Design a protein around this ligand. Structure first.
Ligand SMILES: N#Cc1cc(=O)[nH]c(=O)n1[C@@H]1O[C@H](COP(=O)(O)O)[C@@H](O)[C@H]1O
Ligand SMILES: O=c1ccn([C@@H]2O[C@H](COP(=O)(O)O)[C@@H](O)[C@H]2O)c(=O)[nH]1
Lengths: 257, 257
């Protein structure tokens, strides 16, 4: 039987970051993650403040910000605390353990100092998670493993996907779930987040493929939709965010019965 | 038929960045890529200057440099031109095509502006290559696809590796080779660069595994060794680089005939 997000937040083996997230999802009736794919810090902060009420999570690509500073991220954290959403840096860590630990903690971005969640590809083997967790565990962070991808020709299928699930299971002190197109774990402590989402059928010209919130949440059993252009390119981004939220939220409620 | 690096530089289908690399490998008698895994720009540049005559390539992780600026990269380019080596940013692009184009061109790092070579994981499908190529083509840049990894539990094996080789063949206008543990293509226009290399047997505590230059170049048929800690951890990095250079170069001479 399916548990509500609020009940899942209380599960004995739940990660604190997953619990925080699940509680605010239930409080705000949102399972929408905004993909804030913009080049200017002011745009990032403007979207975060305006859409924050409607979202459970803000997904960043800090490496495309033409004017990144750590003060930008300080300010984003204030907004995250005010409007109640988590910050997920979509870094796709994909190197050996010794390297990713440095990429997570250090450099100019100091990602671990501000991102509640990061994600990682499983292709290097479990050392990618071991390296990240050496930085993330002390800082009370969580990680998502990329079990499937939305893009045309994705190799994250079959035995690769099963490997991602095993890796998460064996590293549950740090891994809180998956980037995937569908439910891949039967354990309710894990979150499923799905990108490649728009209301209308389509794709882009560089291999992105879309499915609807009803399909991904309702039929495929994912928890959270990740939506970028579907919202950001709309004339009215507030109304678009609300349309996606309502869609994902109702799909969840229906599945839950 | 085994061709020298100088001959391979003249192959009909050779990419101009591969040709430039192969020419300087032959001229300088080096098939050593230094993995400059340091956190300080001064150490990076001092290594680049001192070891430049010994290396064909300097591999960077600019996202670990605590004091990155574009002015640091300008000085690195100056050293690369002076000593004759290529700059390879080991970014491991691994996102959908629309995202990686921005991560390559933009942000604070503006990687395409200074890196001769970058690499990409093949897990997203060929969109990853199509996105990078939109940026790299007019700038006369090249890309390496990660066909195999050196780390314990790597999923880059079997059909995954074969998919990487097919993707390289189909995008030979931009893809100039592979990150691999051995020769994965029989086409001599492709470069093979191999990380996980040390003179001594062993590994690290986070999944790295090492093989020797003689094994990797000599028996496994790779072209270039990528060496980080085996050089960086030495008291005298120049002497260490010279050790690796001579090992790798003589291994190469042996399979030539
Ligand atoms: N290239 C690459 C990459 C992929 C791979 O499969 N194995 C690696 O070690 N690397 C990188 O090569 C370097 C290996 O360094 P070391 O020789 O283990 O100190 C690192 O910068 C690591 O991030
Ligand atoms: O498998 C994946 C993994 C990540 N993303 C990311 O999610 C967002 C998709 O945005 P859009 O296609 O909704 O604009 C982008 O930031 C992209 O990098 C995907 O689309 N698919």
């Amino acid at each position: 039987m399916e548990l509500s997000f609020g009940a899942r937040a209380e599960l004995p083996r739940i990660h604190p970051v997953a619990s925080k997230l699940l509680r605010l999802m239930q409080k705000k009736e949102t399972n929408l993650c905004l993909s804030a794919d913009v080049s200017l810090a002011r745009e990032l902060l403007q979207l975060a403040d305006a859409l924050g009420p409607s979202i459970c999570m803000l997904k960043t690509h800090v490496d495309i910000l033409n004017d990144f500073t750590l003060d930008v991220m300080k300010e984003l954290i204030t907004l995250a605390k005010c409007h109640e959403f988590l910050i997920f840096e979509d870094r796709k860590f994909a190197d050996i353990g010794n390297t990713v630990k440095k990429q997570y903690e250090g450099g100019i971005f100091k990602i671990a100092s501000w991102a509640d969640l990061v994600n990682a590809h499983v292709v290097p083997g479990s050392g990618v998670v071991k390296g990240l967790q050496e930085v993330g565990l002390p800082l009370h962070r969580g990680c998502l493993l990329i079990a499937e991808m939305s893009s045309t020709g994705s190799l994250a299928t079959g035995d690769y996907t099963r490997a991602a699930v095993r890796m998460a299971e064996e590293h549950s002190e740090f891994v809180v779930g998956f980037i995937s197109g569908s439910r891949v774990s039967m354990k309710p402590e894990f979150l499923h987040l799905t990108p490649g989402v728009q209301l209308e059928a389509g794709g882009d010209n560089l291999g992105q493929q879309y499915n609807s919130p009803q399909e991904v949440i309702g039929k495929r059993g994912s928890d959270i939709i990740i939506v970028g252009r579907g919202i950001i390119s709309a004339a009215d981004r507030l109304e678009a965010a609300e349309m996606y939220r309502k869609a994902a939220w109702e799909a969840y409620l229906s599945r839950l019965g």
